[PDB]
């Protein structure tokens, strides 16, 4: 059996997740690797952006780093993880390479290298939770996360990175250390080498500016950068040239280097050993402990079990989350107002109210609190409120009303009995 | 007296917005155009994606429409709205062309055409509110919005469009009609003509598949699409080839067609008249009324005034907004828990409680509700909860306690004169 890609995290059609433990155990629990300290390299980011393609050049280096020309014969097609053109996603879930690479580090340590390829985020078959779970899991498992971006590092990219890494952090053991190790902002099709050079040095200068935290920036900009810095012990950036229009657009392209732009190739041959050379391979650490292949299986099972449950808050889009916050805040105000107004008429220090007098004032105050809730301008507007929050508000007000019923009754328990006795009299 | 770009929506370093009303009035209130029905064409989308570059080719068409060679001499630099390479944003706010084009529609109606160029969203200096205000205002003002995207239409693109259009709808008057008119998904650097042909027909098939609502689709995917369809009376899509690496990467490139990929040019010459030909020009309508240039000016002013205040909720990042929702929900659960636990000992059907016992049970139940609040897993971290919600929750529980003191005291009454009489 030849080495090949192995699907380990499956996303089902109903957006539930399954770990193929058998497949994962077969690769990571073999006698040759299971007790080896593990290096886990992942690539993640927006879909359809060359992630699998890049990983297959990483495989070439992993297999041929001892040869003079690891990058390959210029007529050799690019194989391994499945990659292709087209606007529909190819990789789903998380796949790993079936052959764990045993690599000697300069300090004599023999480490196991795992390569992890991921479903691109934001394809139109996936919920936000699907995309967040894949990104979070790949970040939580990897010791090197290659965050693959197109053309630029935009503010929505940083917000997505923040959301996905937060989602990962929420599923992890509490720790005083940073949750993750190495992040690489890999910018595909960097177009401004005259501004910042292709490679890791122009990348570092670009990203140093782009991620810099200033106490004088708007807190929204500050906090996304603070978050990202807090998550990773090392953050780097590599700017890659466009690979040429043949790579991007020719359907007959199959990965041959003779059809890839030369400056892309030069930088690819710098990028890959920079990421993967024996010196650069950071052993995976979780909660301050170096992890073996066997222990990584355990964390993969632990982490996925959390995401298969419902302990964590659901990832929400900007509009959904803001609409919910807007509605939650207005429900609280409307209910608080109903409470305070009811206290004015049937608080503990107020006289007993006849039941239909209490009912009249409750119905009026309930209506006033519903009109107040409805009047608050909220994202998603009236339709989202009515379907998801109005019934909750009216129901909770009703509950408060029944409490006030009992409070009020307590002040004159014989009201109805005495009334009936007196009506006869 | 040369036409040029005019900054009308000014964005300041403090993230405030200013309308240059003098400049806007000078352009759209002149005698020749003030009473004409207006067509407003905007381009909007992520920053650094060639929006101003595109609009400058729109300018060439708008001036040289009658000519077969409107695209220009192949040695002519591209001028108009400022465009350039570099990773840092150039256009800010909203600028318009100072010359309003007068066009005869096929039915003989003469309309005024306004061209709007916008600050790309998500640049490194902008809050989400900044980006949403620009995108929403340009959508609310334009009758044709070219949503300029790079390479593909991704689900986050649809979510951004939903957020920005929702933010626009929030500032508009209630209506029984769709709020906006024409939207064009312009996919720059479309790389898969073997899957969907370059141009409008390939774009239509591609976008139809992207925006289709299906019954078996997760409702989160359904809902963003239903929103987008509910917002626009016409949604189309154009797939544009990459312009060539020189356009993308050469710092001396200045817009000469001779340095632009011929297949890009071929589709560009189809795109611009497809967008801007007299038949294509959609007269701006707001809530079912066609708008004039003078009417459009008032809406510029009215809409920005709404965004300049705080009547509306602010757009927030996914994490910020989720953290707030998570904490608001946990606060409500904590207080609701305290309420129901207090009802078990001081509800109307419970006996009078000695004040010291009530205090002790309050203190315990408050602490339980605070522990509940703090233990609930939330986005944003424990410090966000502690700094922004914990003390208010404790204070609100303290207020509820006082209500319960009064309910409890009502159960221990003694009237000395009544007792001595009894
Ligand atoms: N524009 C561009 N295209 C690339 C690059 N690298 C690979 N491609 C092309 O991008 C497409 C998607 O590749 P793939 O690895 O399957 O993307 P993935 O979905 O992110 O894994 C293929 O057609 C590749 O030839 C790049 O750096 N820039
Ligand atoms: N890749 C690519 N670059 C383009 C395209 N159109 C223009 N450009 C380049 O994009 C860069 C930014 O253009 P500009 O109009 O200032 O972008 P804007 O910020 O969206 O207004 C310039 O270097 C243009 O030469 C396109 O279709 N594809
Ligand atoms: F679109 Al992909 F791996 F991100 F096929
Ligand atoms: F980056 Al821009 F106009 F969107 F300069
Ligand atoms: Mg892939
Ligand atoms: Mg611009």
Author numbering:
A (entry chain B): 30 to 454
B (entry chain A): 30 to 451
Task: Quote the paper.
ATL1 is a resident ER enzyme, residing in the high-curvature tubules of the smooth ER, where it tethers and fuses tubules following GTPase-driven reaction cycles to generate and maintain the ER’s polygonal morphology. The N-terminus of ATL1 is composed of the canonical large G domain followed by a flexible linker region and middle domain, facing the cytoplasm, followed by a short, membrane-associated wedge motif with preference for high-curvature ER tubules. It has been established that the N-terminal soluble module of ATL1 consisting of the conserved G and middle domains, which we refer to as the catalytic core, is sufficient to carry out GTP hydrolysis and nucleotide-dependent oligomerization.
The protein with the insertion mutation crystallized in the presence of the transition state analog GDP•AlF4− and Mg2+, diffracting to a resolution of 1.9 Å. The structure was solved by molecular replacement in space group P212121 using isolated G and middle domain fragments as the search models, identifying two molecules in the asymmetric unit. The novel, dimeric structure aligns with that of a corresponding ATL1 WT protein bound to GDP•AlF4− (25) with an rmsd value of 0.386 Å, both structures depicting a tight crossover dimer of ATL1’s catalytic core. In this state, the ⍺-helical rung containing the insertion accommodates the additional residue by bulging out slightly, resulting in minimal long-range structural changes. According to the DSSP secondary structure assignment, the inserted residue results in formation of π-helix from residues 415 to 419 (50, 51). The primary variation between WT and insertion-mutant structures lies within the middle domain dimer, where a slight translation is observed toward the second protomer’s middle domain within the dimeric assembly of the mutant, with the middle domain interface tightening by ∼0.7 to 1.2 Å (interface-proximal) to 1.0 to 1.6 Å (solvent-proximal). The only exception to this observed domain translation is residue R416, directly preceding the insertion mutation, which shifts 3.6 Å in its C⍺ position and rotates outward.
